[PDB]
Amino acid sequence: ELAGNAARDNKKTRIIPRHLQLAIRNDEELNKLLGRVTIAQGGVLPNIQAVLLPKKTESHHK
Amino acid sequence: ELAGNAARDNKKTRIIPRHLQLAIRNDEELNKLLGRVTIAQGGVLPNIQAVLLPKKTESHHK
Amino acid sequence: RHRKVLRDNIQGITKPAIRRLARRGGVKRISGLIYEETRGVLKVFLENVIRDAVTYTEHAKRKTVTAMDVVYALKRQGRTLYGFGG
Amino acid sequence: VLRDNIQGITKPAIRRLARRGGVKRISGLIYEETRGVLKVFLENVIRDAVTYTEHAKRKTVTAMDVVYALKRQGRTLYGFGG
Amino acid sequence: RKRSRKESYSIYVYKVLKQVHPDTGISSKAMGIMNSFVNDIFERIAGEASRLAHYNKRSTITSREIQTAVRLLLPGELAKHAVSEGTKAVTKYTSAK
Amino acid sequence: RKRSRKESYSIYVYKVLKQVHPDTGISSKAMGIMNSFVNDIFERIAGEASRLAHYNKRSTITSREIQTAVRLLLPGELAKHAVSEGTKAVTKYTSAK
Amino acid sequence: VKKPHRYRPGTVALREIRRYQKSTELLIRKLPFQRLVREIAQDFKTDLRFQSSAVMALQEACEAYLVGLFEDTNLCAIHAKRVTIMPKDIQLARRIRGERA
Amino acid sequence: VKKPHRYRPGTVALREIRRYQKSTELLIRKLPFQRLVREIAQDFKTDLRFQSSAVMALQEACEAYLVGLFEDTNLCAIHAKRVTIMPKDIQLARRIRGERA
DNA sequence: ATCAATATCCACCTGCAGATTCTACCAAAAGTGTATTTGGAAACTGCTCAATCAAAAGGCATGTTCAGCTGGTTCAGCTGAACATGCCTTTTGATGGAGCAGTTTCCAAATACACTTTTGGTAGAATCTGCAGGTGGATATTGAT
DNA sequence: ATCAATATCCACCTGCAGATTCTACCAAAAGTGTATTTGGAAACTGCTCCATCAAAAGGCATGTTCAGCTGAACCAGCTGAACATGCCTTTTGATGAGCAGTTTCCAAATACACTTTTGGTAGAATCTGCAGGTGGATATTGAT
């Protein structure tokens, strides 16, 4: 179910493993179940810590 | 055997759990086997990180 | 009067006891905010283990929690305990 | 010329992996340490794998041996059978 | 002409997928993933059931033991809903013999 | 007058202790520790052997399987020495029937 | 002597380190721990009873766990060129072990 | 236009982050990894052969492990008010997980 | 704010590697019946759990000090991301051609199982001695003038 | 640097809490013999794996260049250790039912032999979503 939801979100009609990883890591409980499990061809979630980006003061400064 | 050696080091003739813990953590391989095991009444090894002990310049300073 | 001893709860796990515990880990200097957080952490740990223990207890139709249940519940979390049977 | 073959794990590939891990800036010294760490992991796995391999009196390493050896180290793997 | 036979849970997963999202497919690799997942959960639950039985000196694995193992392994609400489905299944099976 | 019977590995540990350090004793708690330790290692090894057997569709657990599991679970030199003792034990047992 | 003898900050902590590391007795008192366990158990199932050795085993497990956690905490602290542990260190250690909560 | 267009340091790294995080293809080339596995396995037992899918499985495991490691390392780095990862960070994370070596 | 250069995202197309569906069929599921075992409701009983009051032991909440730790500021290096270039390890793709995974036979070795006969492991009653505790005296580690 | 303070080590002394040794006896372990598997040798085959060639080709080795980073002095202030005190919690010993742990026994539960279907699966025969391609609209970036 979660996979199909992500699938519709990316406009793809066929489930691929990427979707499964996206489903698992976005639900807390499943992530707990599979916290030490690697899904092949899965990758990880997009996530950058806020601190290492550049500051939002990137605009007119005069 | 390791326990009895530690025993002779502490001048006690009877093996107690403390000695077993001492034997286990001081042998690399046994520590690997039982890295996630808790020995009751075992305590831990004496170990202080060097950095939080005071500087050896604790003497005549004039 | 209001005692309820300090909360009638975890707050009986007094500060200097946590200090002694940190001393066992080789630590020298502790901040004032540590205590509460540690307590919460402790609770979570206990919660999980106790839950499992009670569940084992429930399977045997007993009303007494035995040591064995605690051992097994600890074993499933990868914190096997020796010296109390099993 | 070949270079002990660990150097096949090149700098830019490691940089790419670190990029997947959320890393933005990498020191020059990381590479050697990473290589060593990688080696250790592989060694352990393959040892166990080969052990399973040796038990069947086979000479061909199969995926299942790897999967099991991975399972026993607490890094269970999905997607290659069993 | 010699030929083997490897079983899997593929077809049942396919049925479930069509039940939940009729206009949707799934690739082979993901089907393999689901196969591995199912086998892993099966192994965990049965192993835990066995350990519970052996600890209480009972030689039969019944629905009770499975239910207990489920409450042990899975957290909270997932367990509750699952247990409910299982109880419903037992209640339907036992009646309509 | 009713009385049960709980087995352990105590007496054997005591024998070994007297073999390695004649002038030394051991407390009850530590003997319990050793008892639990023995039980744990026994369980791990048997389970691992079982898993190997089941993966190769062989229905018999033999010395070979135990040897393999030992090499898997334990690290390095400990494995080699223990394996040596095991092989010596089998060679002695099989001869002097 | 006029003024009270006074050790410098840190020394007595070190003394406590050596004294408690050399021994093994439990540091937390039985009774509060008993009451804590009893309360939490009451919230899951009612009128339960507990054998003493079970409480002792929980005590051992908890103290060992906390000791390990403070150890990793102290390492993380040393990593940041500090000597004072802080909550974020504990959070870091637990997050890395996967003991999320 | 006279001078070459030049992005500031860090931006292209971020571009690499988003691009590789969106996709899933393996990052390391097959053949070197095959040669690595073959060398190490030869030192344990001789003339071994490997199925392709086993090599792929090791590749997946290795990359997932490394990714996780770098994640914890980065957290450790941030904890020290730095942005650059260094070897002691990796040692710290690995020492905390128990992956001692 | 305002303007050039690339990077990312939408729109529209098209043919094929992978997905889905359609056969044949053969190793599992179900039924039936009968043999075997087992889990759970009654009868006991002996260890253990539940918690109060009084008297005493030891530790903790609090409040007073003050040494040195954190953490922000600023600054001198330094070193690691961008990006150009040229060449070269890898992709792909094909082909051969050896060797091993996996089947199928089969039978000499191995082991479960039903008894029978020994036997040592373990509960429980008599000894015992190492160590917890206690007394006293000598050296070690802190720290100040 | 040397002197007092205090903590801690170390020699010596005593009685008791587990440590240790001695009975009976019964569940447990070895022996015969038989019934029943079962795993390794031998004979075959076809799948998969391994050494080569070649044409790109995308990617890797190297070399510049500079904007951001990593530390290193310095200092305010804060915050948490040392210590004293009184006080408050905790400890520990007074000589009833509840529940863990057995023992019976049989009504329910379920293994095992055999036959009858039948759903699952390998392989042939269709489908098609989406990987590639092409083209154009913004969206970031970055200098000015």
Domain ranges of chain H: 1-101
Within 8 A of C85 by CB-CB distance, chain F residues are: 32, 36
User: Which amino acid is located at E89 in the chain?
Assistant: A
Spatial separation of the C-alpha atoms in residues C49 and A35, rounded to whole Å: 18
Report resolution (Å) to 1 decimal.
4.3
Smallest CA–C1' separation from A62: which nucleotide?
I1
Ordered domains of chain E (ranges, CATH): 3-97 (1.10.20.10)
Q: At what angle do helices H87-97 and G87-97 cross, to 10 degrees?
A: 70
| Å from the G50 CA to the I133 C1' | 33
Q: How far is C22 from chain B (nearest CA, A)?
A: 12
Q: Is C51 exposed, middle or buried (0-12, 13-18, 19+ CB in 10 A)?
A: middle
Q: Is C46 exposed, middle or buried (0-12, 13-18, 19+ CB in 10 A)?
A: buried
Alpha helices in chain B (DSSP H): 2-9, 17-26, 28-33
Tell me which residue in D48, D54, D64 faces F55 most closely, judged by beta carbons.
D64
- What's the token pair of residue A18? 């990427």
Give which of E49, E53, E55 is closest to E69, Cα–Cα: E49
Give the list of residues 6+ apart from residue F84 with CB closer than 8 angstroms, or none: none
- Nucleotides in chain I near protein beta carbons (<7 Å): 1-2, 4-8, 18-20, 27-28, 37-40, 45-46, 48-50, 59-61, 67-71, 79-84, 89-91, 99-104, 111, 121-124, 130-131, 142-144
Chain centroid, CA E57 distance in Å? 25
Instruction: Name the helix (H) or strand (E) containing C68.
Output: helix C67-76
By what method was this entry solved? cryo-EM
Smallest CA–C1' separation from A61: which nucleotide?
I1
Tell me which residue in F56, F71, F72 faces D56 most closely, judged by beta carbons.
F56
Give which of E40, C41, E29 is closest to G95, Cα–Cα: C41
Q: How far is A46 from chain G (nearest CA, A)?
A: 18
- What's the token pair of residue G20? 């408690």
- What's the token pair of residue E18? 């069509």
Please identify residues in chain A, positions 7-26, with a C-beta within 7 angstroms of any atom of strand J: 7, 12-14, 16
Residue in A with minimal Cα distance to D79: A40
Q: How far is F60 from chain B (nearest CA, A)?
A: 27
Reported CATH class of domain D1-82: mainly alpha
* Residue boundaries of the structural domains of chain C: 7-86
For domain H1-101, the CATH superfamily is: Histone, subunit A (1.10.20.10)
Instruction: Name the helix (H) or strand (E) containing E26.
Output: strand E25-26
Reported CATH class of domain C7-86: mainly alpha
Q: What are phi and psi of G26, to 5 degrees?
A: -70, 145
- Check the CA dihedral C59-C65-C66-C67 and report its sign: positive
Spatial separation of the C-alpha atoms in residues G94 and H75, rounded to whole Å: 12
- What's the token pair of residue H17? 């982050």
Q: For residues H75 and G96, is the Cβ–Cβ distance under 8 A?
A: yes
Within 8 A of B30 by CB-CB distance, chain F residues are: 78
Q: For residues B40 and B17, is the Cβ–Cβ distance under 8 A?
A: yes
Q: How many CB atoms lie within 10 A of CB F4?
A: 4
Task: Indicate the pairing of strand C81-82 with strand B14-15.
Answer: unpaired
| DSSP strands (E only) in A1-62 | 14-15, 38-39
Q: For residues E29 and H60, is the Cβ–Cβ distance under 8 A?
A: no
Q: How far is G43 from chain B (nearest CA, A)?
A: 28
- Asked if B54's CB is within 8 angstroms of G22's CB, the reply is no
H86 touches strand J (CB under 7 A): yes
